Amino acid sequence: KFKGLAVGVGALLAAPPIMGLASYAVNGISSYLSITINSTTYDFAPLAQAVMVFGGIGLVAYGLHRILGR
Amino acid sequence: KFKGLAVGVGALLAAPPIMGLASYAVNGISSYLSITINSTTYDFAPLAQAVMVFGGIGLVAYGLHRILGR
Amino acid sequence: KFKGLAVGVGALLAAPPIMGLASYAVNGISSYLSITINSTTYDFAPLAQAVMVFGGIGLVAYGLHRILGR
Amino acid sequence: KFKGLAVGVGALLAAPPIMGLASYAVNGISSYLSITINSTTYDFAPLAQAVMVFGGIGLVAYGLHRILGR
Amino acid sequence: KFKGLAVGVGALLAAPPIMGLASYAVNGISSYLSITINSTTYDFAPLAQAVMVFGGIGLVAYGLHRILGR
Amino acid sequence: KFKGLAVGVGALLAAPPIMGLASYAVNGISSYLSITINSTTYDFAPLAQAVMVFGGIGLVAYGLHRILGR
Amino acid sequence: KFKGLAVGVGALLAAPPIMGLASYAVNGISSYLSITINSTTYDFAPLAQAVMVFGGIGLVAYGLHRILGR
Amino acid sequence: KFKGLAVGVGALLAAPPIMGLASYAVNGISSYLSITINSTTYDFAPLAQAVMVFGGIGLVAYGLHRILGR
Amino acid sequence: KFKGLAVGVGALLAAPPIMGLASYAVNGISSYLSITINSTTYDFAPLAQAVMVFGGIGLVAYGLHRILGR
Amino acid sequence: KFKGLAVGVGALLAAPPIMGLASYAVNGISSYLSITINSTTYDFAPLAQAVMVFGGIGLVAYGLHRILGR
Amino acid sequence: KFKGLAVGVGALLAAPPIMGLASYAVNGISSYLSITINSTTYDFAPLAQAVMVFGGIGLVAYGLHRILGR
């Protein structure tokens, strides 16, 4: 059972240095996520923000998940 | 029967050092779980909190579960 | 699991210097994306703009994606 | 049966001087396991830590394992 | 069994003077890993950084791996 | 195992004096990589630049690669 | 491995005095690459130009190539 | 049977004056087993150490081995 | 068996006065192992260094090797 | 075994007074290794330089090589 | 081994007074290497130049070559 167990543990241990990186990605990008037509520009910046947030909540699941079954 | 029995025992023995880790994950993440639009930010922090709590109650089941049948 | 894990990490790490380049491409092109018939010209410039923006939001997914399954 | 028996015994006898070494490896490495981007660095140090811990629990199995069947 | 056993041991013993070298390689290279177009340059430096980090975590596996089976 | 091990080590040791040379090649060439038609010339200079950058990231892999398997 | 290694190194070292020559060839030729029919002449001069440019980008590959495999 | 028997006996009798010598070799060498690049040197000294240790455990096998079959 | 046995012994006995010489060779050479193009020179000095180090670890094997089989 | 052994030793002993000579050859030649067409001359000088450098690294191999097998 | 060794040494020692001569030959000839048809003459002078340059690079090989094998 430890095969999955560690997979889970690792996934938990890896969540904060991944979500650390992840956020540096999304900030490094937010400048490049808005569509200017004339003068009025319209971002889709914080769409991609959410990508990260449910990715966040999601990883801490995967860990806790792979500890308890398929 | 001991094949499952130990699987259960292990799962109980492993519950507090897993929920130890787990919590360090969710705190290491709570900074990175909120979606700021203008100035007003809106977390989904404690959603992921719950992920852990029913994961908690859940593991102590799995242990006690694999001791008594499919 | 690290095989995919890194694939993900790399993909996140690579998102801002890719979206850096990408944007230099789309600006280097916007002059060459409009169809002049008589005198009235009609761009399709910012079509290609969007190409980049959902490409943007998309990469930060791929990273976070390859960390959690097929 | 002694063919496997000793394989097991050896594996047990070898567990503490292997996990002795192993740990010196993982400490000798933890300096070289973190990805600095600007100023903010983000380790994946203790991922590799776990590698050792379930490797640990795992070896003491292999010993006890090769004593009792395929 | 010692044939693999040592292969493993060696691999552990060799991990910190390899990851010592490895890092001197990646620093000796980071100057030569960025693509300047006009004035704005865009590195892919820390992509190659990660190459090393999962290489790191990976070696300490290989050691512990070749001790326990195919 | 040392047969591959050294191949790897060498490859790491050789990465910075190769990427040293490599860059002197690509600069010695960038003058000779642009196609002038009338007056307007159009380089493909920094295409060949990238050749080097993923060659870079690539070598530091090969080293770390030949240490761990086929 | 040095057999290929040097082949590569040489190829890099040889790229700028080859692309030096090469260009003197293509200029020495551009006078003799246009098909005059009546009065209107039509060159194919800069076709042969490109021959050199992708030859350029190509050599700096071959070098970096023969360092890393078949 | 004595043909192999003695081969074994000899091999046992020869193990401590061989491992006596062997160690004098590996110490006489450890000064000449480290790769200094700038100032930071990185040994591979104790790799070769292990060479001896599993050589050790190995000889005492060969003896006991050639007493009992192919 | 002594035919190989001595071959081994000799090889061990010969390792430190060979690696003594060897190193005097590689130092006597390191001045003559760097390729200067304009002003910037680029050594491949410590490539040849490694040649010696795995040669080192390798000899102490050959000795211990020729004591135990083909 | 000494037949090859000395061949090796000699080859090591001979490496620095050969690479001494060798370099005097390549300097005595570098004046006579460049192809001037009009006014612009283009050397292939440092091609031949490399000839020596991998010849260098190569000899110190041959020595260490002929000590350990075909 | 000295039979080839000297052949090599000699070949190195002989390279600069041969390439000394060689060049006096090719200059003594360059007047007599161009085909004049009407008034426009067309040399093949520097073809023969190259003959010497790769002859150059080539000799310094032969020396270093005959030191290390068939």
CSV table of N, CA and C in Angstrom, one decimal, chain F residues 39-63:
chain,number,residue,atom,x,y,z
F,39,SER,N,16.6,46.5,-50.4
F,39,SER,CA,17.3,47.3,-49.4
F,39,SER,C,16.9,46.7,-48.1
F,40,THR,N,15.6,46.4,-48.0
F,40,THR,CA,15.1,45.8,-46.8
F,40,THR,C,15.7,44.4,-46.7
F,41,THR,N,16.5,44.2,-45.6
F,41,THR,CA,17.0,42.9,-45.3
F,41,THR,C,16.2,42.2,-44.2
F,42,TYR,N,16.2,40.9,-44.2
F,42,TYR,CA,15.5,40.2,-43.2
F,42,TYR,C,16.3,39.1,-42.6
F,43,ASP,N,16.8,39.2,-41.4
F,43,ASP,CA,17.6,38.2,-40.7
F,43,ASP,C,16.8,36.9,-40.4
F,44,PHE,N,17.6,35.9,-40.2
F,44,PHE,CA,17.1,34.7,-39.5
F,44,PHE,C,18.1,34.4,-38.5
F,45,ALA,N,18.7,35.5,-38.1
F,45,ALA,CA,19.8,35.4,-37.1
F,45,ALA,C,19.3,34.6,-35.8
F,46,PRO,N,18.2,35.1,-35.2
F,46,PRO,CA,18.1,34.5,-33.9
F,46,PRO,C,17.4,33.1,-33.9
F,47,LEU,N,17.1,32.6,-35.1
F,47,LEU,CA,16.8,31.3,-35.2
F,47,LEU,C,17.9,30.3,-34.7
F,48,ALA,N,19.0,30.5,-35.3
F,48,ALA,CA,20.3,29.8,-35.0
F,48,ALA,C,20.8,30.0,-33.5
F,49,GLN,N,20.3,31.1,-32.9
F,49,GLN,CA,20.6,31.4,-31.5
F,49,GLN,C,19.9,30.3,-30.7
F,50,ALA,N,18.6,30.1,-31.0
F,50,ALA,CA,17.9,29.1,-30.2
F,50,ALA,C,18.5,27.8,-30.3
F,51,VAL,N,19.1,27.5,-31.5
F,51,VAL,CA,19.7,26.2,-31.8
F,51,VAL,C,20.6,25.9,-30.6
F,52,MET,N,21.2,26.9,-30.1
F,52,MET,CA,22.3,26.8,-29.1
F,52,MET,C,21.7,26.7,-27.8
F,53,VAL,N,20.6,27.4,-27.5
F,53,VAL,CA,20.0,27.4,-26.2
F,53,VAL,C,19.3,26.1,-25.8
F,54,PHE,N,18.7,25.5,-26.7
F,54,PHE,CA,18.1,24.2,-26.4
F,54,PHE,C,19.2,23.1,-26.5
F,55,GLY,N,20.3,23.4,-27.2
F,55,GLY,CA,21.5,22.6,-27.2
F,55,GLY,C,22.1,22.6,-25.9
F,56,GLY,N,22.1,23.8,-25.3
F,56,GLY,CA,22.6,24.1,-23.9
F,56,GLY,C,21.8,23.2,-23.0
F,57,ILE,N,20.5,23.5,-22.8
F,57,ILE,CA,19.7,22.8,-21.8
F,57,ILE,C,19.8,21.3,-22.0
F,58,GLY,N,20.0,21.0,-23.3
F,58,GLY,CA,20.1,19.6,-23.7
F,58,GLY,C,21.4,18.8,-23.3
F,59,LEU,N,22.5,19.5,-23.3
F,59,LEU,CA,23.7,18.8,-22.9
F,59,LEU,C,23.7,18.5,-21.4
F,60,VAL,N,23.2,19.4,-20.6
F,60,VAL,CA,23.2,19.3,-19.2
F,60,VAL,C,22.2,18.1,-18.8
F,61,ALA,N,21.4,17.8,-19.8
F,61,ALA,CA,20.5,16.7,-19.6
F,61,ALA,C,21.4,15.4,-19.9
F,62,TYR,N,22.0,15.4,-21.0
F,62,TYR,CA,22.8,14.2,-21.5
F,62,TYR,C,23.7,13.6,-20.4
F,63,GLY,N,24.3,14.6,-19.7
F,63,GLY,CA,25.2,14.2,-18.6
F,63,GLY,C,24.4,13.5,-17.6
